[PDB]
Paper text:
Glycoprotein B (gB) refolds between prefusion and postfusion conformations to facilitate herpesvirus entry into host cells.
Cryo-electron tomography had previously identified the structure of a membrane-bound HSV-1 gB partially stabilized in its prefusion conformation by an H516P substitution. We observed the H516P ectodomain gB with an appended foldon to assume the postfusion form under negative-stain electron microscopy, with single-particle cryogenic electron microscopy (cryo-EM) revealing that although the DIII helices were interrupted at residue 516, the H516P ectodomain with an appended foldon was nonetheless in the postfusion conformation.
Residue numbers in the entry:
A (entry chain A), B (entry chain B), C (entry chain C): 111 to 474, 490 to 725
The structure:
C-alpha cells in the first residue's frame, strides 16, 4: 500500500452529488378478458355411413372326366347385381331370392340358372360366423358340378344370392364412396330427387338408380319389419346392388371437427393481434383481431351448433352464478389453421360496465377449407415462453424500481457522512484519493500525491516532551517525497494519510492502547511508545457486507427424441400394398420363362 | 424549487422507525432420490416370424388353331395345396415334388397331370434371381400347350410345384397372420397341441392342420439336413400349404416395447405424485405414487426380463463401486401411457441408512393394454419449465433474503444519521418537509409551510456591523409568507430552509469562500460578501449511486414448423391402394359401354 | 426484551471490518457471426415423371344359347402389349391402331382378331370423361359376342387398343418404377444406351427395350406433332408397352430436399461445436466444427445448386448494400440429420478485417444417405432454453456485480458510523450485544451480560438534588444482576443499556419532554419527572426500509396434447388394404363349404 500527501483544498475545484433520479414506473398490467372457447381443426375423418350390398355369386365350371380322374378345365366366376324389383319384392318383403341371375354383361343379356334347373324362390340364411365381420346372409354353400359322364367336357352353373351389410366411407367433395369390400361407387352418398339432391354427382344412367320413399327395412335374421320409415336409395352397379338410407348433405358432413373445449381462455390484445392463451392445456394462439366470417367455411354448419352447445354447457357448469355473457359467440382464425369460437364473459362484481363492453365486443361470394397443421408445439412453446418471460420481467422491473429507490434513499446518509470525514467520502465518490473541505453546501477537492512505503518512518514516541501531560493523537512521522529527497516533518493520518502538521494534541492518559494503519498493516503503541508492527491478518475481521450467492443457469443440451419413428409407424401396418404388389408381380419373372416360344 | 419555513417542533407529534423485520427462511431443498430407470411404450410392431409356403401352380389353357394362326380361347389358373404326406416324404425328405396336383376345389376332388403325362417325381431347382426377394424354388418354367391340330380347341395342363420362404406377420390378439404374398391365414401362429396351445384360435377343420415333433428341415439349395430338431406346424389352406416352427405364446410376444434406458432418473415426491426427471434425455414424467401391478399388463412377461437386464447392466457399468441397490425394481404408470421401471439407489457415503430406506421403499382378475401417446413434447416441456423455474426461484429467494437483511443492517446507520440532521432524515422518512427535534429515544415532527421563490431576497453581506470580527455562518434573508405580505427577518438554512433566527455566528476568517443552495441553484460569496448567482449545472457532479441496467426479456413469436407434413408422409409411399383402386375400377366406365345391349 | 450491562472495553480483544472485495468481472459477450443459411432434409418424396402406356384389351367369351336364354359359359380377359413397330408407325405417326393383337403368352405366339374379321386400321378416340383422371384414348367400346345359334357354344373375340397417360413413381436406388395403374416396371427410369446409362438396372431381355433418338410425340386429341425432339424410351412388358422420355440420373434425382431458407442464421462457437440459431424460425442446431464433405452425399448434385441460388437471392434482397461475403458457402451436418449450407457475412462498417476472416473461415471413396429425424422440437426447445437462459444469466450477473459494488460503497459509511456509536455498530457487526471503544484505527469489544426485565426499576425524577439547575440526561435506575441479588446503582442508556455511572449531566431546561426505551416499550417523562409507561405501538411508526415484493414462479403441469392421434391419421385413408384383404379372403369361409366333397 502507498501513502498519500494532500495539500489544503481551495476553491479552485468544487464538486456536488447527483440529485435523486426518477425511478421507473410500474408497467401497466395486461388486459385479460375471461371467456369460454372451443377450438376446431381440419376434418380428416371420412364420412362414414351404413349400407347394404346385394349380389349373386354366379359361377359356371367346365369339368373333364377321365378314365380314373376328374379335372377342372375352367372355372368362370362373376358377380351379378340384384334388380330393384327383386330387392324390394323378394328379399326385403319375404327374405327369399330368385335362383336365376339375369343381368347385362359385355353388352349381352346373359341369364343363369342354379343347377341348370327351373327357377325357384330360395330362402336366405346367415353365413358362417367370422370374427370381426359384419352380418351377412347367403342361400347356397355347396357348389354344383356336372354329373360324371366318361370322356366329356360337361358344364354346371351355381347361383348363390348373397346380401351383406358393409360400412361405406366417403371423403370431400363427397362425389363418390367406397364399401368395406373395396368396391367403388361413383355416386354421391347424398344423391337423390328431393330438395335439390339431384344436383349431386352421378356417373350412372338414370335407370340404374331408384329411390323408395317410406321404406320399411326388414331384418333377415330376426323377421321384424322395422319401427319407423326411411328414404332408401338403390343403385344397380355393373357387378352389385348397393342400398343405403338417404340424408341431407349439409347437416350430415362438416369440414371442421371439434378438437378442444377450454373452460378458461384468456384473451389479450397487443401488437395488433389477439392472444388466446389457455392455462388448462398450456397453449397460446394468435389471430388478426377480425372475426373470421363463418359463412366462408365450406360445409361448416356443424361449427355453430357444436360451439353453442359446448359454450352453454360450460357456462351452466361453471360460470352460471359468477359471470355473465357479453355478446354472441365470436369466431377467429388462429395461426396454424385453428378456428377458435370465443365467448367473452364479465364478472358479476362489475356488471355495471356491461353496456360499455357489449357494443365494443360487437365491433370485432366464395368458400374455402381451412388447413390445420399437424403440430401444436409451436403454440405450446409460445405459452411456455410467455409463462416464464412475463413473470420474470415483472420481478426484474420490481428489482430495478426498488434498487433505484434505495439509491435515492441513501443520498441522505451521504449528505451527512461527508461532513464527518470529507476526505474519505470525497475519495470514494470522486474515484481517487483527494482531500476535501466543506465550502458551505458544496465540497472542494485537491488531488493527493502518492508516497513510497519505504520513504516513511514513524517516530517511536508520541509523547510531547515539550509539555508533560500533553500527547499527540497520532504518531509522528518523517517522509521524503522522493527516493533520496530531503525528509519532510509530518504526522500520520487516517488511511495511510500523511498530514504536514503536528496539531493533533490530546492530554496524556494512563493505559494508552492504540492501533494505527501503516502501509499494509498496523503499528501498535503502548503508553505513548512504539511497540511493534503487525500484519493485517493478525486482527480478527468481521464482515459488514451482506453476502449474495447468485448462481448462473447451467447450459443444457436437448438430444433428439421420438416415441415412434416414421419407419416404425409404417411397419405397424399388418400388410403393405407396395411390398405385396412388388413380390406378386415378380412371380412370372421368377417362376417362369417370359421369352421362350414353342411352336410346331 | 420552493423554500420552506418550519417552526420549533414540540411534543404534539412523535414518530419512530420500524424495527428490523424477520427475513424469509431459505426454502427446503427438494428430496431427489437417485436410481436407474427403463421406460416402456405401447408395442405397435406386428409379431414377425419365418414361414415356408408350398403350393402347385396348376394351369390349363384352351388353344384354337386357325389356318395360319393360334389363339388362346381361355386360360384357367389356380393354386393347389401340397398335402402333408408329400411335403414330408418328397420335398423335405428328397427335394422332389410330384408332377400331379390332387386337391379339393368347388367341392370336387379334382386332379391334374403335368403335360397330361403319367406321374413322375420332378426335381426342385432355385428360381430366377430377383433383387430384394426371399429364396424360392420351383420345378417347371416352360408352360405346356397342346400340339397343333388344324381347326380344334385342344387343352393342355401344366403343374409347377413351387415352394417359397416368406415373412409372416401377426398383430394382437394374434388370432391370425398374413404372409409376404398377402395371403391371410386364419389361425393363431401359436396354435398347437402341447401345453394348452389347442385353446388358440383356428378357423379350419381339424384334419387341415398337422404338427410334427422332432422335425429336421432340409434346405433345398444346399442339401444339408439341419443341426437340431424343431416343432413344425403344417396347415393346408384351400389354395396353399404353409409351414412354420411352433413356439410358446407368452415368451414370444409382448404388448410393451423397451423405449429408453436412463442411467440417472431422479425421483421427487410433491403434490401427491412422483416426478421422474431425466437430465440425459431432458424428460419429466408423473405418476400416482402407487406401483402399477405388473400382473395387470396383458402379455407383459418381457417387461420384467428386459427391465432387470438393463438395470443390472447399467448398475455394473456405473453404480458398481459408488451406490447400492435399495429394494427390488418398482414399476409405475406415467401420464401419457409410459410404464417406468424404477430401481432406487443409495450412495455408499450414507449406506448406514439402508435399513431405514428399504422398508419405506417397499411400501410403494383382469388385464389391460397400455395406450401410449405419440408425442413426448408434453414431458419435454415439463422438464424445460422445471429446469428454468426451479433455479430462477432459488435466485429470487436469495435476492429477497439478502435484500431484507440489508434493510435491517442499514437500520443502524439511520439511528445515528437522525441525530446529526433530524430535519433531513425526518423529511425523507416521513415523506414531507418537516422539522424535527430529538426528544430522547423518539423524534418529534412539525410540518413546514412552503414559500414562493420570488418572495425571498438575500442580504449582500453577513458581516456583523455591531461586532467586527464576528460573521454569520449562513447568509441573511428577508421573506414574506404571502405574495405582498409583510417581509419577515430570517436566515438561510440547509436545503432551501429558512430559519427565523440569526444565531449562527462564527469568527470572520480571511479567504472566505462558500456556496449555499438557493432555489434551483446556488449563491456564491467571497470575503463575506455576495458575488453572484449560478445554476446547478455550473458545478461538477459526481454520481454517488450504483448504476444497475436491468433489461426486460424481449417478446418472441413462434411460427409453425414441421419437418414433414402429413401430406408429405402420405406421398412417401410408392403406391397408394386408394388411388390405384379408384383408377382401375373406372376402366369399364372409361373404355367401355356399360348400358348398351346387343341381341338378335 | 432483556436489559444489558457492559463493562469498559479494554485491549484484550480487537476487531476490524473486512476490506472491499473484488467484484466479479462482466462476462465476455458471445461471438456471433452473421450469415445466410439453407437447411436440407432427407428426401422421402419418390421421383415422379410422366409416362405413356400402350396395350390392347383382348377378350374372348364363350356363349351358350338356350331355347329361350343366353348364358356366358366363360370369359377370358388378357392385356396384350403393342409392339414398337406399331407404336412408332401407326399410333404416333397416324393415330391408328391395328385391330389384331399379336403377342407371346405362356410361351406361345398367340394372335387375336377383332370380331374375328380381317385386320383393319382403327381410329383412336378419347375415352369417356371421368373426374380426377388422366387423358386416355381407346378404339372400341362395344364388346363383340357370337351370333345366336340354337344349342351351341360359340366364341367371339374383341380387341380394344387402349393408350393412356399415367404418372410414374420411383424410389431410391431408382432401379424400378410403378405406374398409376399399380403395374411394376423392373427397369431403372434412367436406363438407356447413352453416357453410361446402360449400367442401370434392367430385368428384361435386350430385345424388349428400344430407344428412339429425336422422337417427335404426336398428341392424339389435338393432331399437333410437338415442337422439339426428345429421347423416347420404349419397353415391352409381358402385358403392356410403356414409353417415357429419357433423362440423365444425376441432375434428375436428389437424396436431400431443401427445407428452409434462413435470412439470419447466427453462428457461435463454444464447447467444441458450432451453434446455428435462427431467430426467425426459433430453431438451434449443433455441428462438429468440421465441414461435412459434400462429395460424400449420394446423388447430392442438387444441394450445391439450390444452396447457391438461395444464398444469392437472399444476399441481393437484404445484404446487398450492408454486408460482404466471406469465403465460399460452407456445409455442416447438424444433429438429427439436417445438412446446413452456411454463408458467412461481414458488415461493411468493419470490412478492413476481411483479409483476417477469409483465411480463418476457409480453414473450416464412399457415399452415404443422411437420415433426418421426423421431429424438430429437440432444436426448438434448445432455442427456447437459450433464449431465456442467456438473458436471465446476464441480468443475474449485473445484479451480483451491482450488489458487490454497493457493499464496498457502504464500507465508507460504516467507517464513520462506528465512531458516533461504537456500541451499536459493534453489536450488529459482531452479532451480539458488546460494548466498544475506539483504540485508534481498530475497535475493542467486551461482551455484555443480560439482565432480567423484572430486576430493574427506574427512579421517579432525574432532578439532581445536590446541584439545583443540574439535571441528568437519562433516567436513573437500580438493577440487581441476580433475581434476589443486591441492587446495583446505575443509569439508563440507549437500547435498554444499563451503564454503571451517573455522569450524563445537563442543565435543567423548562418544557422538558422526553421518551426513553425501557424493555418492550418506553418511559415518558415531563419536567424531569416520571409520568407513565407506554407500549411500543403507542407511537406512530414510519418504515425506513425499501419494500421489495419478489414472487416465485408458480408450478405448471403440461398435459398431453395432439392435433391428430396416430389412429386418426390411419383412419384418414379412404380404403385400407389390410382390412379389405381380410374381409375379401373370408368370402370362401363365410359363404361356402370348404371341406365337403361331392362325387358319383
Ligand atoms: C392476417 O392478415 C394478414 C394481412 O394483414 C394476412 O397476410 C396476408 O396473407 C395473404 C394471403 O393471400 C398474402 O397474399 C399477403 O401477402 C399477406 N400479407 C402480409 C402483410 O403478410 C394473414 O394471412 C392473416 N392471418 C390470418 C391467420 O388470417
Ligand atoms: C391416478 O389416479 C386417479 C384417481 O386418483 C385416476 O383418475 C381416475 O381415473 C378413472 C379412470 O377410470 C376415472 O374414472 C376417475 O374419474 C378418475 N378420477 C379422478 C379423481 O380424476 C388417474 O387415472 C390415475 N392416473 C394414472 C396415470 O394412473
Ligand atoms: C461428431 O463427432 C463425433 C466424434 O468426435 C461423432 O461420434 C462418433 O460417431 C461414430 C459413428 O460411427 C461412433 O462410432 C463413435 O463412437 C462416436 N464417437 C464419440 C466420441 O461419441 C459424432 O457422430 C459426430 N456428430 C455428427 C453430427 O456428425
Ligand atoms: C386496458 O388497460 C388500460 C391500461 O393500460 C386500462 O385503463 C383499461 O381499463 C383496460 N381495459 C380493459 C377493457 O381491460
Ligand atoms: C343457474 O343460475 C340460475 C339463476 O340465474 C339458477 O336458477 C339455476 O338454478 C342455476 N343453475 C345451476 C346449475 O347452478
Ligand atoms: C457461495 O456458494 C458457493 C457454492 O455453494 C460456496 O462455496 C460459498 O461458500 C458461498 N459463499 C457464501 C455462502 O458466502
Ligand atoms: C426430505 O426433506 C426433508 C426436509 O423437507 C428432510 O428432513 C428429509 O430428510 C428428506 N428425506 C429424504 C428421504 O430425502
Ligand atoms: C464391481 O464391484 C465388485 C465388488 O462389489 C468387484 O469385485 C467387481 O470387480 C466390480 N466390477 C467392476 C466392473 O467394476
Ligand atoms: C444502460 O443501458 C443502456 C442500453 O445499453 C445504455 O444506453 C445506458 O447508457 C446504460 N446506462 C449506464 C451504463 O449507466
Ligand atoms: C471472440 O471473442 C473474444 C473475447 O472473448 C474477442 O476478443 C474476439 O475478437 C472475438 N472474435 C470474433 C471473431 O468475434
Ligand atoms: C446491389 O449493390 C450494387 C453495388 O454493389 C448495385 O449496383 C445494385 O443496384 C444493388 N442492387 C440492389 C437490388 O439493391
Ligand atoms: C406484497 O405483495 C402481497 C401480495 O400482492 C401484498 O399482500 C402485500 O401487501 C405486498 N407488500 C407490500 C406492497 O409492501
Amino acid at each position: 500500500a502507498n501513502f498519500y500527501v494532500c495539500p489544503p483544498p481551495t476553491g479552485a475545484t468544487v464538486v456536488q452529488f447527483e440529485q435523486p433520479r426518477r425511478c421507473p414506473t410500474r408497467p401497466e398490467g395486461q388486459n385479460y378478458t375471461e371467456g369460454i372457447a372451443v377450438v376446431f381443426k381440419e376434418n380428416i375423418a371420412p364420412y362414414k355411413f351404413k349400407a347394404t350390398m346385394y349380389y349373386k355369386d354366379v359361377t359356371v365350371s367346365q369339368v373333364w372326366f377321365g378314365h380314373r380322374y376328374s379335372q377342372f378345365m375352367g372355372i368362370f366366376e362373376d358377380r351379378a347385381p340384384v334388380p330393384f324389383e327383386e330387392v324390394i319384392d323378394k328379399i326385403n318383403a319375404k327374405g327369399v331370392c330368385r335362383s336365376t341371375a339375369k343381368y347385362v354383361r359385355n353388352n349381352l343379356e346373359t341369364t343363369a340358372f342354379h343347377r341348370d334347373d327351373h327357377e325357384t324362390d330360395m330362402e336366405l340364411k346367415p353365413a358362417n360366423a367370422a370374427t370381426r365381420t359384419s352380418r351377412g346372409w347367403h342361400t347356397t354353400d355347396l357348389k354344383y358340378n356336372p354329373s360324371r359322364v366318361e370322356a366329356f367336357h360337361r358344364y354346371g352353373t351355381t347361383v348363390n344370392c348373397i346380401v351383406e351389410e358393409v360400412d361405406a366411407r366417403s371423403v370431400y367433395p363427397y362425389d363418390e364412396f367406397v364399401l368395406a369390400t373395396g368396391d367403388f361407387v361413383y355416386m354421391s352418398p347424398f344423391y337423390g330427387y328431393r330438395e335439390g339432391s339431384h344436383t349431386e354427382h352421378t356417373s350412372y344412367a338414370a335407370d340404374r338408380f331408384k329411390q323408395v320413399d317410406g321404406f320399411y327395412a326388414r331384418d333377415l335374421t330376426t323377421k321384424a319389419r322395422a319401427t319407423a320409415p326411411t328414404t332408401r336409395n338403390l343403385l344397380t352397379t355393373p357387378k352389385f346392388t348397393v342400398a343405403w338410407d338417404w340424408v341431407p348433405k349439409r347437416p350430415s358432413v362438416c369440414t371442421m371437427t371439434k378438437w378442444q373445449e377450454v373452460d378458461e381462455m384468456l384473451r389479450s390484445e397487443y401488437g395488433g393481434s389477439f392472444r388466446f392463451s389457455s392455462d388448462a392445456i398450456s397453449t397460446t394462439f394468435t389471430t388478426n383481431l377480425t372475426e373470421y366470417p363463418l359463412s366462408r367455411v365450406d360445409l361448416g354448419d356443424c361449427i355453430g351448433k357444436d360451439a353453442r352447445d359446448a359454450m352453454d354447457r360450460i357456462f351452466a357448469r361453471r360460470y352460471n352464478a359468477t359471470h355473465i355473457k357479453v355478446g354472441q359467440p365470436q369466431y377467429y382464425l388462429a395461426n396454424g389453421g385453428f378456428l377458435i369460437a370465443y365467448q367473452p364473459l364479465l364478472s358479476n362484481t362489475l356488471a355495471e360496465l356491461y353496456v360499455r363492453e357489449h357494443l365494443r365486443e360487437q365491433s370485432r361470394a366464395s368458400v374455402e377449407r381451412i388447413k390445420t397443421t399437424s403440430s401444436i408445439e409451436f403454440a405450446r412453446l409460445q405459452f411456455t415462453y410467455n409463462h416464464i418471460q412475463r413473470p420474470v420481467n415483472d420481478m426484474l422491473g420490481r428489482v430495478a424500481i426498488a434498487w433505484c429507490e434505495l439509491q435515492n434513499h441513501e443520498l441522505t446518509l451521504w449528505n451527512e457522512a461527508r461532513k464527518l470525514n470529507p476526505n474519505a467520502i470525497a475519495s470514494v465518490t470522486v474515484g481517487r484519493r483527494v482531500s476535501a473541505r466543506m465550502l458551505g453546501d458544496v465540497m472542494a477537492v485537491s488531488t493527493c500525491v502518492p508516497v513510497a512505503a519505504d520513504n516513511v518512518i514513524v517516530q517511536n514516541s508520541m509523547r510531547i516532551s515539550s509539555r508533560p501531560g500533553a500527547c499527540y493523537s497520532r504518531p509522528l512521522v518523517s517522509f521524503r517525497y522522493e527516493d533520496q529527497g530531503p525528509l519532510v516533518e509530518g504526522q500520520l493520518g487516517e488511511n495511510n494519510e500523511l498530514r504536514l502538521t503536528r496539531d493533533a494534541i490530546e492530554p496524556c492518559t494512563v493505559g494508552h492502547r492504540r492501533y494505527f494503519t501503516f502501509g499494509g498493516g498496523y503499528v501498535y503503541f503502548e503508553e505513548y511508545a512504539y511497540s511493534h508492527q503487525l500484519s493485517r491478518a493478525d486482527i480478527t475481521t468481521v464482515s459488514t457486507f451482506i453476502d449474495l450467492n447468485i448462481t448462473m443457469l447451467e447450459d443444457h443440451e436437448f438430444v433428439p427424441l421420438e416415441v415412434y419413428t416414421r419407419h416404425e409407424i409404417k411397419d405397424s401396418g399388418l400388410l403393405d400394398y407396395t411390398e405385396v404388389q412388388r413380390r406378386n408381380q415378380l412371380h412370372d419373372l421368377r417362376f417362369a420363362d417370359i421369352d421362350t416360344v414353342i411352336h410346331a
